């Protein structure tokens, strides 16, 4: 607690010096360099402390989230993305602390989302040369987008987080970065219909998401399939209206893959597939005939008694769509 107090003091003093410089632009106004104030090791220690539940509680009493966000924001403003490795490092460690302080923490989420300049700075970091920094920023946005309040939803949308993350996903090379990026998009895709449209608008995004449905994880997990299929289920309401977008799904084998998902041990994967099939099986005879021919009817019929409400509802609704529309071939 005494240590934490000292570290937060150092970070606050530095920020005040930066804000003074920023406000002295209508020479005795030398631009502060964080290296000259040993900022990296201060945030490093705060980052490490932030992994411990007890130390977090202490950091919050001292407004640690605010202070660390203010530091990230001012360094991003000052040096942009033409910044040095010291800066990239400090943004990573600040972002990792922000991630730890925003897990389920209603006040901390609200605070951070209310800091509009900090939000724009976070979104900007998704194009960092450091993909690890992208992963860390995507983790912050993931946390902020989970159960976001109405003001937080609005701010997340307005600062362009959706297009920025969807564009970021297309370029990531590492599975860990992709996991965080898709988790944030899964959350954001539920928020409103503008976010859904923004996803679908990104060139290549739907083909990419269909790709994630058959992802082969190194780490023996289903995280990518769950989040990628989650995004797809959330946007499938709008894909259903757009013949071009339906066609991108078809020619990446989406329908047979979704049927295979109905067999998953993961209730999340099954639920996501039931919801996507509910929407794609609506009012489209070619996709209805395709599903019939793949044995969809008996597969969906298997799931209608689920105690998982979304599986029960989606499977029965998809099944109704197909049963209303038995292809002539069959008759």
UniProtKB/TrEMBL annotation:
Domain of life: Eukaryota
ARM repeat residues: 253-295
Protein function: Tumor suppressor. Promotes rapid degradation of CTNNB1 and participates in Wnt signaling as a negative regulator. APC activity is correlated with its phosphorylation state. Activates the GEF activity of SPATA13 and ARHGEF4. Plays a role in hepatocyte growth factor (HGF)-induced cell migration. Required for MMP9 up-regulation via the JNK signaling pathway in colorectal tumor cells. Associates with both microtubules and actin filaments, components of the cytoskeleton. Plays a role in mediating the organization of F-actin into ordered bundles.
Family (UniProt): Belongs to the adenomatous polyposis coli (APC) family.
Protein name as annotated: Adenomatous polyposis coli protein
Natural source organism: Homo sapiens (Human)
Shown chain mapped onto the complete sequence: 409 to 740 of 2845
């Amino acid at each position: 607690h005494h240590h934490m107090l000292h570290l937060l003091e150092q970070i606050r003093a530095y920020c005040e010096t930066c804000w003074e410089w920023q406000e002295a632009h209508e020479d005795k106004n030398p631009m502060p360099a964080p290296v000259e104030h040993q900022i990296c090791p201060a945030v490093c220690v705060l980052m490490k402390l932030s992994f411990d539940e007890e130390h977090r509680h202490a950091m919050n009493e001292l407004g640690g989230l605010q202070a660390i966000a203010e530091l990230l924001q001012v360094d991003c403003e000052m040096y942009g993305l033409t910044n040095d490795h010291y800066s990239i490092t400090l943004r990573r460690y600040a972002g990792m602390a922000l991630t730890n302080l925003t897990f389920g923490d209603v006040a901390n989420k609200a605070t951070l989302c209310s800091m509009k300049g900090c939000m724009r700075a976070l979104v900007a970091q998704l194009k960092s040369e450091s993909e690890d920094l992208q992963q860390v920023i995507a983790s912050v946005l993931r946390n902020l987008s989970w159960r976001a309040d109405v003001n937080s939803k609005k701010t997340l949308r307005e600062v362009g987080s959706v297009k920025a993350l969807m564009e970021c996903a297309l370029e990531v090379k590492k599975e860990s970065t992709l996991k965080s990026v898709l988790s944030a998009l899964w959350n954001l895709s539920a928020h409103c219909t503008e976010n859904k449209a923004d996803i679908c608008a990104v060139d290549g995004a739907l083909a990419f998401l269909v790709g994630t449905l058959t992802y082969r994880s190194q780490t023996n997990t289903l995280a990518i399939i769950e989040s990628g299929g989650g995004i797809l289920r959330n946007v499938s309401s709008l894909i259903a209206t757009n013949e071009d977008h339906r066609q991108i799904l078809r020619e990446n084998n989406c329908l047979q893959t979704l049927l295979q998902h109905l067999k998953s041990h993961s209730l999340t994967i099954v639920s996501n597939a039931c919801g996507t099939l509910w929407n794609l099986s609506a009012r489209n005879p070619k996709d209805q005939e395709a599903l019939w021919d793949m044995g969809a009817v008996s597969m969906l019929k298997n799931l209608i008694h689920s105690k998982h409400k979304m599986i029960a509802m989606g499977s029965a609704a998809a099944l109704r769509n197909l049963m209303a529309n038995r292809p002539a071939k069959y008759k």
